[PDB]
CSV table of C-alpha atoms in Angstrom, one decimal:
chain,number,residue,atom,x,y,z
A,1,UNK,CA,92.9,92.9,102.2
A,2,UNK,CA,95.3,93.3,99.2
A,3,UNK,CA,95.0,93.8,95.5
A,4,UNK,CA,97.4,93.8,92.6
A,5,UNK,CA,97.6,95.5,89.2
A,6,UNK,CA,98.2,92.5,87.0
A,7,UNK,CA,99.6,92.7,83.6
A,8,UNK,CA,97.1,90.2,82.4
A,9,UNK,CA,93.7,90.5,80.7
A,10,UNK,CA,91.0,91.5,80.1
A,11,UNK,CA,93.2,94.7,80.1
A,12,UNK,CA,95.3,96.0,83.0
A,13,UNK,CA,93.2,95.9,86.2
A,14,UNK,CA,93.4,95.5,89.9
A,15,UNK,CA,92.6,92.1,91.4
A,16,UNK,CA,92.2,91.1,95.0
A,17,UNK,CA,94.5,88.6,96.9
A,18,UNK,CA,93.9,86.3,99.9
């Protein structure tokens, strides 16, 4: 699994990739 700290909202957060 992988995740990224996106510069989008709501607010800076970590989303998963796949």
